[PDB]
């Protein structure tokens, strides 16, 4: 989304700079092949989740020592709470952790607590449109 | 060789050494042709030599399409006949040719591939640009047009020799490429 | 437009007529007249004689009538 | 007050290496490169002869630049940074903390 | 704007299979395989039909529906429906030099093989109350 | 202050001598004359160009031509109008046209 | 057909010069007689410096002078060169063909030099 | 040498009407504003036809040779760096053609060729001349046809180019004319609009190729084809 | 069928052919451009160069020459310093 926003404003400039001087422009040459093949690569590259202070360490190299580290290694999720905060109370294991995350997955030193990865049974719901859901109470009462 | 080149056009500038009106000149010129929006300069053809001419406010003749030297000066002459019959007292100044082209065909087609790998450091052919090779040599000033079909077109000249000795130094050179 | 157009066209020609050697004054028909102002207003009439030809440094009075001044100018 | 700026010598802020041909040198030596030109630009801009206005934004583009080399992590300003991030590892940051 | 008018509508998003251009600008399918060992960034172009609609206020609206043209690339995630190695058997996966129980879901990018960790942030559009005990 | 081309054709001579009888009898001054000259210049050229709705063909051979102010003024030698309907030989024709 | 264009480009004539006659003060009666008028009239040379050496190089200049034949007024589009013709692109233009008026729309010819 | 100023983080150093009284002043020459938006040029402009990078760098090499040499300052900018594009496909021996340059150029062909005539006239360097062997897997590849078709055409080319029936024709319309050869006689068949679309030469140089090439048909194939 | 080879763009040969019948500005006797001059200066006070160079249809240094006689440049801190066709 942030990428298509800067793709169509280097567009806008460069038809801008072609219609100031009264004639028409050639839509190929407009739009800027370079930005979205280049930036989705230098974040998913580097990690670095944003056009260079957003989020960091988002993207990982894979884990290829066993095939258990690579499975823990994809099925894993992260914590923004910054990892130095000498906190107690976000890092413990929660009630509400059941079967949802491991309770014995954790990795030890600074990020105990912040990093965890998805038990055995546990989908993460992907997303729908609430419009049917919306128009079904509409038809109800 | 036993064949030598045949002239189309000699480009030659003279001076009449004073200022004109083009204005006054298309006005009352027979064969004026003088539009401002497409140059800063007055045409003028006559059909006997069949020759073209072209003049500036600057005073400044600038003739081509002659067939010979000798041609070129007596159309100058006619077309400073002319400039001078409508009042302006045009001379015939430092009269110089500054351009001839010749043509002639060779009557045997030519690898042109093969002489642009031997003269690569003289020889340009590109035929997306231009079907025919491009050739120029150090010692004349002259670049040369050899084409497959044998034709060959000298232009950039000073004299009819730099002609002759500009085909003549070319011949047994193209005389190794014979198909 | 109108009222502020033909004195540019006054100014001017009475200067290209003070460089021919013209030191004479001139009334302001005998300027109108080559300056092909003959419609010009009344209005604009009584304005360039009341303020637009005594404001400007370039007009002297001269018994009544309008002319150059080379005296103010260096010569 | 200060009013002549000690230049380090180039063992302070040596050249690294990187493939070779790069020769890049320390952030010291590219903020000094700044300050000697922005420095040149006001003293013959004294006679050159400008706006006031134009003297008095330049000056204080000046301050700010040798603040920022003296002490960078002070409030307010924004932090001197190379192209493409990195902020620039003033003395402070040379001294003070783990790495210091 | 300049007096005439043009108006770029953007239209349907078409994705093709992820390739690879080399020296002479020959299209082939990439290998993840190949995008592994020639350090390639495994993605996919993705094209746009654009509708480039004209005005010269003389009711003359005439557009042009300039079809796929092409704007980046989007690195595929392996295994994925839009990937090249999508239902394919045992044997082709292994004719292909890529493993069958290879669980992908990892891009490729520059040969190095990069996963995006799940971030995890406080759920949108519902209301909390918190007590700041300070 | 118009084109002012067809003046010199018969219709533009029997108008401008028209114009003379009514000004030697002083019923009219000059200035209206060259307000009437002008008025059916532009209405000649508008009816040209809207109400003319045929075309001609013609062959022939060119001895002198000329340009000067956007003006031609081209002279023809055995001239051959034709046309679908109707061919017409002629000795020598002057072209004038402009813009 | 070139009578009834010629009554309507009368018509237009006598519908365009009534606001001018309004104008300035002529009276409308002129105008009918101007039309009744209108409708009556037609129904080794070392030394370069001098040039003399040469004459009749020259053609008649009397064809201009004259303007006796036929002279056709007419606007032009595009004329091209084609090192031999000129290429004719015309619009509408007028002639007179030995007395009787032509006319036309659109015109393509050719001359040789 | 430079260092950039970037946003405030603190409040403090705002104006009376913000604008942070603290920005990067930019001046770096303008040779090097100029070089900076041309390589910006050549990147943008060999992304679209997707070029490997070591040919953007030997442009970049080349602008910058041609920039410092100091003989082509009458002429835009974009048309040294489309020139230096051509140069640098070229030497690495995967040459395109001067339409495929002109498709993602903002630039004519007639300026692109006097640049690239200037060009070799100025630096001093020698380019091989095309041979048809070269665009044959391009064209066959972005056509989408397959390896047999691949050699066929290209043994066609060649033996057309070197038993002469084509003196002087240019090797673009010999090479869409193998293109033709081969597709016309196989399942797969593509038509002149198409063969014309992806190689720039128009119909009537393909029929031009076609008429002149039909004779002597068998010779010009390959041993083996599976007609 | 994307960056076909066409050995030159649409807009470009549009652009191209119209640059060759709307002409080059050819350069005019000085009466009638001051004639125009003043006759655009009737319209309104002040002008920008490139707005006079539209109207007047001239070549800008050839326009700039005949208005350094007669015309004068005042500052104005609002946009720029442009020009005065006022005599005085």
Not at chain 2, 21 to 39: H, M, Q, S, V
Request: hydrophobic letters at 40%.
């Amino acid at each position: 989304r942030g990428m298509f926003k800067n793709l169509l404003k280097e567009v806008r400039i460069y038809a801008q700079k072609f219609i100031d001087r009264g004639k028409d422009f050639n839509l190929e040459l407009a739009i800027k092949t370079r930005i979205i093949s280049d930036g989705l690569k230098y974040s998913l590259a580097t990690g670095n989740w944003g056009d260079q202070q957003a989020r960091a360490g988002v993207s990982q190299v894979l884990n290829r020592l066993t095939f258990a580290s690579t499975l823990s290694h994809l099925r894993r999720l992260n914590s923004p709470i910054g990892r130095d905060g000498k906190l107690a109370k976000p890092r413990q294991l929660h009630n509400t952790l059941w079967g949802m995350v491991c309770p014995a997955e954790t990795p030890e030193g600074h990020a105990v607590g912040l990093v965890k990865n998805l038990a055995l049974m546990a989908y993460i719901s992907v997303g729908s449109q609430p419009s049917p859901i919306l128009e079904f109470l509409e038809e109800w009462s | 060789s036993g064949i030598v080149p045949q002239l189309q056009n000699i480009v030659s500038t003279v001076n009449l050494g004073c200022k004109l009106d083009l204005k006054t000149i298309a006005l009352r010129a027979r064969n004026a042709e003088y539009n401002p929006k497409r140059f800063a300069a007055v045409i003028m053809r006559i059909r006997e030599p069949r020759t073209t001419a072209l003049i500036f406010s600057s005073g400044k003749m600038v003739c081509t399409g002659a067939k010979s030297e000798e041609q070129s000066r007596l159309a100058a002459r006619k077309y400073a006949r002319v400039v001078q019959k409508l009042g302006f007292p045009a001379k015939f100044l430092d009269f110089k040719i500054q351009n001839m082209v010749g043509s002639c065909d060779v009557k045997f087609p030519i690898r042109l591939e093969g002489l642009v790998l031997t003269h690569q450091q003289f020889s340009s052919y590109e035929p997306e640009l231009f079907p025919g090779l491009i050739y120029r040599m150090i010692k004349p000033r002259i670049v040369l047009l050899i084409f497959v079909s044998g034709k060959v077109v000298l232009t950039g000249a000073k004299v009819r020799a730099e002609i002759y000795e500009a085909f003549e130094n070319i011949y047994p050179i193209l005389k190794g490429f014979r198909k | 437009g109108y009222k502020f157009g033909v004195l540019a066209k006054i100014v001017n020609y009475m200067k290209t007529r003070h460089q021919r050697g013209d030191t004479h004054p001139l009334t302001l028909d005998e300027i109108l007249d080559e300056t092909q102002h003959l419609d010009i207003g009344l209005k604009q009439k009584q304005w360039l004689m009341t303020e637009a030809l005594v404001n400007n440094p370039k007009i002297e009075v001269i018994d009544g009538k309008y002319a150059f001044k080379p005296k103010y100018n260096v010569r | 007050i200060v009013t002549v700026l000690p230049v380090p010598p180039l063992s302070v802020r040596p050249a690294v290496v990187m493939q070779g041909s790069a020769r890049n040198q320390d952030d010291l030596t590219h903020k000094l490169a700044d300050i000697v030109k922005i420095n040149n630009q006001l003293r013959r801009n004294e006679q050159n002869g400008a706006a006031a206005h134009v003297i008095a934004e330049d000056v204080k583009l000046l301050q700010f630049h040798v603040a920022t080399m003296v002490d960078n992590e002070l409030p307010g300003l924004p932090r001197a940074m190379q192209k493409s991030g990195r902020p620039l590892k003033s003395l402070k940051q040379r001294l003070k903390g783990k790495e210091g | 704007q300049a007096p005439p008018r043009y108006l770029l509508k953007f239209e349907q998003i078409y994705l093709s299979k992820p390739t690879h251009w080399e020296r002479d600008g020959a299209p082939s399918p990439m290998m993840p395989n190949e995008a592994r060992l020639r350090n390639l960034t495994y993605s996919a172009p993705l094209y746009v039909d654009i509708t480039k609609t004209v005005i010269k206020e003389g009711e003359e609206q005439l557009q042009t529906q300039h079809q796929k043209t092409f704007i980046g690339k989007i690195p595929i995630m392996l295994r994925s429906t839009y990937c090249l190695l999508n239902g394919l058997t045992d044997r082709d996966l292994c004719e292909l030099n890529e493993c069958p129980l290879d669980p992908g879901g990892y891009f490729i990018i520059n040969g190095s093989e990069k996963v995006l960790i799940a971030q995890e942030k406080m759920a949108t559009n519902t209301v909390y109350v918190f007590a700041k005990k300070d | 202050m118009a084109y002012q081309l067809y003046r010199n054709t018969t219709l533009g001579n029997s108008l401008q001598e028209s114009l003379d009888e009514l000004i030697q009898s002083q019923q009219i001054t000059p200035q209206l004359a060259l307000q009437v000259l002008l008025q059916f210049d532009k209405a000649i050229n508008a009816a040209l160009a809207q109400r003319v709705r045929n075309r001609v063909n013609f062959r022939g051979s060119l001895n002198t031509y000329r340009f000067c102010d956007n003006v031609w003024t081209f002279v023809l030698n055995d001239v051959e109008f034709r046309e679908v309907t109707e061919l017409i030989k002629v000795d020598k024709v002057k072209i004038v046209a402009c813009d | 057909t070139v009578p009834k264009l010629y009554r309507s480009v009368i018509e237009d004539v006598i519908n365009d010069v009534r606001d001018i006659f309004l104008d300035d003060g002529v009276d409308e009666q002129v105008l009918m007689e101007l039309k009744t008028l209108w409708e009556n009239k037609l129904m080794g040379q070392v030394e370069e410096e001098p040039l003399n050496s040469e004459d009749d190089v020259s053609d008649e200049e009397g064809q201009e002078l004259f303007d006796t034949e036929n002279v056709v007024v007419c606007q032009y589009d595009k004329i091209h060169r084609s090192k031999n013709k000129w290429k004719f692109h015309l619009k509408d233009g007028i002639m007179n063909l030995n007395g009787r008026d032509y006319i036309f729309s659109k015109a393509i010819g050719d001359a040789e030099w | 040498l430079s260092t950039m100023i970037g946003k405030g983080t603190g409040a403090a150093s705002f104006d009376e009407f913000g604008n942070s009284k603290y920005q990067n002043r930019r001046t770096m020459s303008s040779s090097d504003r100029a070089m900076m938006n041309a390589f910006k040029e050549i990147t943008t402009m060999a992304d679209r036809i997707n070029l490997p990078r070591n040919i953007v760098d030997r442009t970049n090499n080349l602008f910058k040779q041609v920039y410092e040499q100091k003989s082509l300052k009458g002429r835009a900018n974009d048309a040294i760096a489309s020139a230096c594009l051509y140069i640098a496909c070229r030497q690495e021996g995967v040459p395109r053609t001067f339409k495929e340059i002109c498709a993602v150029s903002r630039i004519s062909k007639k300026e692109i060729g006097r640049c690239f005539k200037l060009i070799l006239k100025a630096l001093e360097t020698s380019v091989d001349l095309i041979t048809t062997g070269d665009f044959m897997s391009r064209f066959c590849s972005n056509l989408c046809l397959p390896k047999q078709v691949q050699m066929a055409a290209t043994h066609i080319a060649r033996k057309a180019v070197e038993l002469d029936l084509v003196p002087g024709r240019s090797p673009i319309s010999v090479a869409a004319a193998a293109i033709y050869m081969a597709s016309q006689a196989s399942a797969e068949k593509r038509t002149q609009k198409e063969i014309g679309d992806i190689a720039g030469v128009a119909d009537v140089t393909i029929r031009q190729s076609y008429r002149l090439i039909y004779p002597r048909a068998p010779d010009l194939f390959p041993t083996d084809f599976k007609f | 069928t994307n960056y076909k080879p066409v050995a030159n763009h649409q807009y470009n040969i549009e652009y191209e052919r119209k640059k060759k019948e709307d002409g080059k500005r050819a350069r005019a006797d000085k009466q009638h451009v001051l004639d125009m001059l003043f006759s655009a200066f009737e319209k309104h006070q002040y002008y920008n160069l490139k707005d006079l160079v539209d109207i007047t249809k001239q070549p800008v240094v050839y326009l700039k020459e005949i208005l350094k006689e007669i015309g004068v440049q005042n500052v104005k801190g609002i946009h720029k310093n442009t020009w005065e066709l006022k005599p005085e």
